[PDB]
């Protein structure tokens, strides 16, 4: 009555090596980048809305609201210098997704993250839905210009404490993250409408599934599609006050592996016979990055 022979990581691995599992969608959040040193930017414990006093904001969230940014961009860019990562080294989890791509299994990676690590790990634009945009590129904000600038250009402006301006028209240049008040990416809805007709397995890694519309993606899978959560904490279940079903007598397709995302991806790779391939890929790419 179900595609998984048992509701465990071993059941998922056997399903992944069966004829039925052809197309995997990954849904990933901040939990896959914390081991790379990237903090969760939607976590109150990160303290983004603390130490904003010198900027005299009308409300703390204004530093990430598009209309405020366009008139007063300096607070955002001062904060961006403070938080700019010291290195961009993707995690075991990112390279696990590269292995999925290499093996013809990756239909799409939907990511809430803005840190570019999916791209550094070798996922291409076609493979990715960056649901909240990315720092990978930046654009002039003038509608008639829209000159594109790479992250190296934007990094230099952030570190020199020079507000980035377009060389063509002298308008503000903004990283391609989705500020509050901006439209969500058309690609998010377009790809969702196509991909979830085709998916055989949902791999949900490093997201607490608490931010919409991203969290709603789990409800777009066909009823039969197994869903594996790899996360430090169980997530995605229905709210009893107002979903994933891991633990009831009616559970039939959802599996929770609770732990660090890197360790869960390593465990899954090991069951699949991919551990040596994943170790070799990670060690090579990390050595390459360390040598830059």
């Amino acid at each position: 009555e179900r595609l998984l022979d048992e509701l465990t990581l071993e059941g998922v691995a056997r399903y992944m090596q069966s004829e039925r599992c052809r197309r995997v969608i990954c849904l990933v959040g901040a939990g896959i980048s914390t081991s790379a040193g990237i903090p969760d930017f939607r976590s109150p414990s990160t303290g983004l809305y603390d130490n904003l006093e010198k900027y005299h904001l009308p409300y703390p969230e204004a530093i990430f609201e598009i209309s405020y940014f366009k008139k007063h961009p300096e607070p955002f860019f001062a904060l961006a210098k403070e938080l700019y990562p010291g290195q961009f080294k993707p995690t075991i989890c990112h390279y696990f997704m590269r292995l999925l791509k290499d093996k013809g299994l990756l239909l799409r990676c939907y990511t809430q993250n803005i840190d570019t690590l999916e791209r550094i790990a070798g996922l291409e634009q076609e493979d990715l839905v960056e649901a909240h945009g990315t720092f990978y590129t930046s654009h002039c904000v003038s509608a008639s210009c829209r000159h594109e600038y790479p992250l190296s250009w934007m990094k230099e402006k952030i570190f020199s404490e020079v507000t980035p301006k377009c060389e063509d028209c002298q308008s503000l240049v903004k990283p391609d993250i989705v500020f509050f008040g901006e439209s969500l990416p058309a690609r998010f809805f377009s790809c969702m409408q196509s991909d979830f007709l085709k998916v055989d397995l949902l791999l949900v890694m490093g997201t607490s599934l608490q931010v919409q519309p991203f969290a709603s993606l789990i409800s777009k899978a066909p009823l039969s599609t197994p869903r594996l959560l790899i996360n430090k904490e169980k997530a995605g279940q229905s709210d009893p006050f107002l979903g994933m079903d891991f633990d009831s007598k009616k559970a039939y397709r959802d599996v929770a592996w609770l732990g660090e995302c890197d360790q869960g991806c390593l465990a899954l790779a090991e069951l699949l016979g991919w551990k040596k391939e994943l170790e070799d890929l990670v060690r090579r790419e990390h050595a390459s990055i360390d040598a830059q």
């Binding site: 969230e61 909240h132 989705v178 500020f179 509050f180 008040g181 901006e182 439209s183 969500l184 990416p185 058309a186 809805f189 931010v211 919409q212 519309p213």
Partner: peptide, 7 residues
């Protein structure tokens, strides 16, 4: 398209 909000 829907606009990005806190929730």
């Amino acid at each position: 398209l829907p606009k990005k909000y806190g929730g």
